[PDB]
C-alpha cells in the first residue's frame, strides 16, 4: 500500500523537526519515502475592540497560523509500522495518518 501522514502545528520549527524525525525513522527502517511537502498554511485572523467601553476605531488584530506537512510512504514494511507508531513527538504536533 501507501500510508499517508498529515502533520499540523502552530509552529514551523517544531513541525519540521517532527517531519525530519519521521523521514529519517522510515528509511533507517528501510522504506522509500515520498515528500515531505509543505501544504498551504491556513491563517485565521481576529479583530477585537481593546477598550472596555466606547472608542470603536481602536482595535487589535491577531492571527493563528496552522502549518501543514504531508509525507507519503512507499514501502510499508512490518518494521516501518512499529517504528513510526512509537515515536517521541512533541506536544504541539497533531498527527493523523492514512491507510
Amino acid at each position: 500500500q501507501r500510508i499517508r501522514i498529515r502533520l499540523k502545528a502552530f509552529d514551523h520549527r517544531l513541525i519540521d523537526q517532527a517531519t525530519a524525525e519521521i523521514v529519517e525513522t522510515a528509511k533507517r527502517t528501510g522504506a522509500q519515502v515520498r515528500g515531505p511537502i509543505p501544504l498551504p498554511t491556513r491563517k485565521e485572523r481576529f479583530t477585537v475592540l481593546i477598550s472596555p467601553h466606547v472608542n470603536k476605531d481602536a482595535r487589535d488584530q491577531y492571527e493563528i497560523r496552522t502549518h501543514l506537512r504531508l509525507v507519503d510512504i512507499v514501502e510499508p514494511t512490518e518494521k516501518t509500522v512499529d517504528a513510526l507508531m512509537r515515536l517521541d513527538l512533541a506536544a504541539g504536533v497533531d498527527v493523523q495518518i492514512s491507510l
Partner: protein, 101 residues
C-alpha cells in the same frame, strides 16, 4: 455579570441538551410531506408546546465563560473580546500572536 443571569444560562443549556438533539423527532419526522400530513401532523404541532419554553437552542445567549458578557463573544475561544485580549497578551492562548501583514 449578575450571578442569576449565568444560572439562567447554565440551566438553559442543560435543559436544552435534556430534550433537544434527542427529541427533535416531533418536528423533523412527523411534520413531513407524506401520509402523516393528516391530523397526526397537527397533533405534532400541538405537542411541540408541551415542552418547556426553554429546551430550544435559540434561547442560548452564548455568553463568555469567565465574566458572562453577552456581547463581543468569540466562538473560537469561548471568551469575550476583553478576556481574549487580556489572556493573549499574557501568552495563554497558544499560537495567538499579534497579526501584522
Amino acid at each position: 455579570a449578575k450571578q442569576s443571569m449565568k444560572a439562567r444560562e447554565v440551566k438553559r443549556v442543560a435543559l436544552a441538551d435534556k430534550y433537544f438533539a434527542k427529541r427533535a423527532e416531533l418536528k423533523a419526522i412527523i411534520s413531513d410531506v407524506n401520509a402523516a400530513s393528516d391530523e397526526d401532523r397537527w397533533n405534532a404541532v400541538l405537542k411541540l408546546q408541551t415542552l418547556p419554553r426553554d429546551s430550544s437552542p435559540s434561547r442560548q445567549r452564548n455568553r463568555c465563560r469567565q465574566t458572562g458578557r453577552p456581547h463581543g463573544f468569540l466562538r473560537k475561544f469561548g471568551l469575550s473580546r476583553i478576556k481574549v485580549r487580556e489572556a493573549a497578551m499574557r501568552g495563554e492562548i497558544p499560537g495567538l500572536k499579534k497579526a501584522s501583514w
